[PDB]
Design an enzyme around this catalytic site. Structure first.
Site, PDB file in Angstrom:
ATOM      1  N   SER A  43       0.705  -1.264  -0.006  1.00  0.00           N
ATOM      2  CA  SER A  43      -0.011   0.094  -0.044  1.00  0.00           C
ATOM      3  C   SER A  43       0.706   1.481   0.183  1.00  0.00           C
ATOM      4  CB  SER A  43      -1.107   0.079   1.046  1.00  0.00           C
ATOM      5  OG  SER A  43      -1.905  -0.740   0.712  1.00  0.00           O
ATOM      6  N   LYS A 205       2.867   6.527   5.229  1.00  0.00           N
ATOM      7  CA  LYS A 205       2.048   5.277   4.558  1.00  0.00           C
ATOM      8  C   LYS A 205       2.475   3.946   4.966  1.00  0.00           C
ATOM      9  CE  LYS A 205      -2.020   4.022   2.768  1.00  0.00           C
ATOM     10  NZ  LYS A 205      -1.452   2.454   3.272  1.00  0.00           N
ATOM     11  N   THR A 206       1.628   3.103   5.513  1.00  0.00           N
ATOM     12  CA  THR A 206       1.898   1.708   5.605  1.00  0.00           C
ATOM     13  C   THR A 206       1.476   0.961   4.636  1.00  0.00           C
ATOM     14  OG1 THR A 206      -0.205   1.347   6.711  1.00  0.00           O
ATOM     15  CG2 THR A 206       1.420   2.184   8.321  1.00  0.00           C
ATOM     16  N   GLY A 207       2.075  -0.385   4.384  1.00  0.00           N
ATOM     17  CA  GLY A 207       1.535  -1.114   3.606  1.00  0.00           C
ATOM     18  C   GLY A 207       1.919  -2.745   4.036  1.00  0.00           C
TER      19      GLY A 207
END
Length: 262
Positions: A43, A205-207
């Protein structure tokens, strides 16, 4: 490097690979582990998407309050905000915050249709100095993260340059960069936030994907004006597509590196 031996220890202990690019934006000091190895981005490509949307709005190519229809058939797992509005319309600005704040998958697919798909994200990467990011697929196939598979990958260094560009650089005119930063600060998913002391916040932003791929990229803001660029990409070393994700490890990484950047 002594922090280098500490990271090899975490890799050994948890059977993971740790990719790290951490920089103090005020001192210009940087710390690195596998900065040039390739990791599924999952993500984290969403920042680039939202950034490109903002770029296009700047020039009037689209407008942030342009409406997009949310087809129920187009819904894909992990779409908490787009689900609520299936069969109705959201604006591009809404879709951006859904993608960034809750990692809404269908929001990202809709945004990708608007900006030109996966190749547009790649082109965007290149435009900001990021020479490693490639998006090839849509949500949710992109999260497959097969070892050795170059699809939908970046590197800690490559993502750091683009994240720096969009949040602290010149990809956007300064006030629109301010909005992107506010959008990412309001996110409900941060992994690194747990390893930060009181007073600190993050625009990040994490993924998360298969093989334990767990990422977090963005900037940490200190109470006393300090500014840390932090990009963490981790995966299991195991060939287990369903290995546990490594969210607690990001927080632990965050606390580990912070003292050597300040």
């Amino acid at each position: 490097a002594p922090i280098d031996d500490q990271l090899a220890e975490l890799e050994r202990r948890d059977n993971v690979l740790i990719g790290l690019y951490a920089a103090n934006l005020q001192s210009g000091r940087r710390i690195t582990h596998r900065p040039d190895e390739m990791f599924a981005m999952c993500s984290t490509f969403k920042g680039y998407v939202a950034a490109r949307v903002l770029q296009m709005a700047e020039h009037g190519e689209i407008s942030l309050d342009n409406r997009v229809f949310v087809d129920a058939d187009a819904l894909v797992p992990n779409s908490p905000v787009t689900e609520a509005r299936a069969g109705a319309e959201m604006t591009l600005a809404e879709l951006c915050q859904a993608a960034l704040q809750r990692s809404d998958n269908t929001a990202a697919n809709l945004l990708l249709k608007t900006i030109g798909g996966p190749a547009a994200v790649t082109a965007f990467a290149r435009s900001v100095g990021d020479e490693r990011t490639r998006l090839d697929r849509w949500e949710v196939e992109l999260n497959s993260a097969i070892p050795g598979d170059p699809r939908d990958t970046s590197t800690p260094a490559a993502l750091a340059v683009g994240y720096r560009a969009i949040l602290a650089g010149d990809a956007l005119s300064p006030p629109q960069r301010g909005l992107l930063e506010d959008w990412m600060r309001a996110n409900q998913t941060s992994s690194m936030r747990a390893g930060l002391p009181e007073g600190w916040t993050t625009a990040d932003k994490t993924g998360s994907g298969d093989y334990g791929s767990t990422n977090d990229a963005g900037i940490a803001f200190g109470p006393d004006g300090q500014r840390l660029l932090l990009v963490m990409m981790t995966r299991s070393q195991a060939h287990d597509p369903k290995a546990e994700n490594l969210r607690p490890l990001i927080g632990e990484l965050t606390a580990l590196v912070l003292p050597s950047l300040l």
